[PDB]
Design an enzyme around this catalytic site. Structure first.
Site, PDB file in Angstrom:
ATOM      1  N   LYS A 263      52.978  39.202 -27.358  1.00 34.67           N
ATOM      2  CA  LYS A 263      54.077  40.110 -27.738  1.00 34.67           C
ATOM      3  C   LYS A 263      55.114  39.475 -28.636  1.00 34.67           C
ATOM      4  CE  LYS A 263      53.555  43.560 -24.286  1.00 34.67           C
ATOM      5  NZ  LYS A 263      54.037  44.210 -23.067  1.00 34.67           N
TER       6      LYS A 263
ATOM      7  N   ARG B 157      48.938  40.410 -17.130  1.00 34.22           N
ATOM      8  CA  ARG B 157      48.138  41.243 -18.007  1.00 34.22           C
ATOM      9  C   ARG B 157      48.026  40.556 -19.370  1.00 34.22           C
ATOM     10  NH1 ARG B 157      49.105  45.043 -22.073  1.00 34.22           N
ATOM     11  NH2 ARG B 157      47.747  46.900 -22.031  1.00 34.22           N
TER      12      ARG B 157
END
Ligand SMILES: Nc1nc2[nH]c(S[C@@H](C(=O)O)c3ccccc3)nc2c(=O)[nH]1
Ligand SMILES: Nc1nc2[nH]c(S[C@@H](C(=O)O)c3ccccc3)nc2c(=O)[nH]1
Lengths: 272, 264
Positions: free
Chosen positions: A211, A245
């Site tokens: 991210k 995740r």
């Protein structure tokens, strides 16, 4: 600390790695990729058919069913692994439960009309993620007086909202939603105080993999973020996060083994 | 605001630093080339030694060690702004290393060769105190006792605490569980109020945990590094500088958002 679904359980006494299966012949490919992730030590596969690209059209329910449901089915009837489904749609929630999905992972925390009712009716575990705004505009001007406090309020409210709809606490997971309506400093403030979300006494799920909070810190593109992603993973798992995740399962699982060995030696069983 | 001073410069230990490991095997050109690469990857210290100075490596005469070590240290000191740690146990190499611009004495024998203690004192340079011995009643308490003793031994030889660095010595007379006990309780070694150096890169505590060979331990080494740095370790000694530095930047951003500035 355990979750229960589809006649099996998930033991959350140690961290678990959730492998990302993006499904935005593709079915065979999905299954090959799921297999690889399982072999790498992923214990949950997160099947996702609606991308969160800000300018993008939302997918129709018919398209999302076509992408997701056969994938979830194929996996359920071929492997023992747990399956999370990345959807906000009541019909996809229902259909996924019927073909063996274990966890409803909704980035919108069941805010779609009927989503809450549908998830309640499956009896499946539900992950509640913080997002400020919606995916189209959330990254324009993310703003908080106190980002920890605001995410924490949100969790109090959504838990209450889920319990009122008949979903018991014991089925809920909480996820602070890294990058969902958050600048860089917001994201690191939440990571740094992540352990403080344990007061809910609920499992903690985090997704930082590749991210912006790594990309913007290091000034690298999406394929140069492994080391940073692992660091995020370890930081989270050292603070007692239950599910991580990720895209890069093997490497994350190796890191988690090291975290587990460290936490085992600790009397505390956690860092804060 | 922990700070080390040597050779007219200083090392600011308010954040973690990555120490790259340099092999000495023409070889001098290669050394400088590899030092350059590690600096560009963000190493702020270069530990000269590597496979020539590992445990079990062939011993050398004083004369040979000066010939292989001193030019490397000299070449780096002349070319780069970086700090330089030197791996040696010999008083002569300690003296000569200090003369050509080494900043840190890194002796895995804790200055136990005859004259080594005296030579290190004379240099005025920072000194790393690494624990080495596998069997323990309480590994943390034994490693901790050893630090109490070596600090006293160093202060008695005229080396002020402000020049000492403490390293628990992962893999040095330690089985798998000993290593993880120390890693788990690393933050408790801050009561000495001294810098902490750790080296876990590609070690057995990873290889045996994951059952992989030396070249497949990056992910585990990074986790070790992050675990140590989250606990306020000041120097991290590694083979894979670029990746470790990226991971440290994540640790730094996290610790900066933290009011405490440390985990435990
Ligand atoms: N529970 C949970 N579900 C999640 N789904 C995602 S999609 C995200 C990505 O970066 O993969 C993403 C963001 C923007 C565009 C594409 C994909 N992120 C999470 C998370 O952080 N938690
Ligand atoms: N201060 C400090 N110096 C050090 N030198 C080393 S050599 C070690 C390795 O794995 O590189 C090693 C050990 C055993 C065999 C081969 C190589 N480890 C450290 C450390 O942990 N701290």
């Amino acid at each position: 600390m355990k979750l229960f679904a589809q006649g099996t359980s998930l033991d959350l006494s140690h961290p678990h790695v959730m492998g990302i299966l993006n499904v935005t012949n593709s079915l065979i490919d999905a299954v090959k990729h799921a297999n690889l992730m399982i072999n790498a030590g992923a214990t949950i596969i997160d099947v996702g058919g609606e991308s969160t690209r800000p300018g993008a059209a939302e997918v129709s329910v018919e398209e999302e069913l076509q992408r997701v449901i056969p994938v979830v089915e194929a996996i359920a009837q071929r492997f023992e692994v747990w399956i999370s489904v990345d959807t906000s749609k009541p019909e996809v929630i229902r259909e996924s439960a019927k073909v063996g999905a274990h966890i409803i992972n909704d980035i919108r925390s069941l805010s779609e009309p009927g989503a809450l009712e549908a998830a309640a009716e499956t009896g499946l575990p539900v992950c509640l993620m913080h997002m400020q705004g919606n995916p189209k505009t959330m990254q324009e001007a993310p703003k908080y007086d106190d980002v920890f406090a605001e995410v924490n309020r949100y969790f109090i409210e959504q838990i209450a909202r889920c319990e009122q709809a008949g979903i018991a606490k014991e089925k809920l997971l909480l996820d602070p939603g890294f990058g969902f309506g958050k600048n860089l400093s917001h994201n690191y403030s939440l990571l740094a105080r992540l352990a403080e979300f344990h007061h809910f006494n609920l499992p903690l799920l985090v997704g930082m993999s590749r991210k912006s909070m790594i990309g913007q810190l290091l000034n690298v593109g999406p394929s140069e973020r492994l080391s940073g992603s692992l660091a995020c993973a370890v930081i989270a798992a050292m603070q007692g996060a239950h599910i991580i995740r990720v895209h890069d399962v093997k490497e994350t699982v190796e890191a988690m083994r090291v975290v587990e060995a460290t936490l085992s030696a600790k009397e505390n069983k956690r860092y804060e």
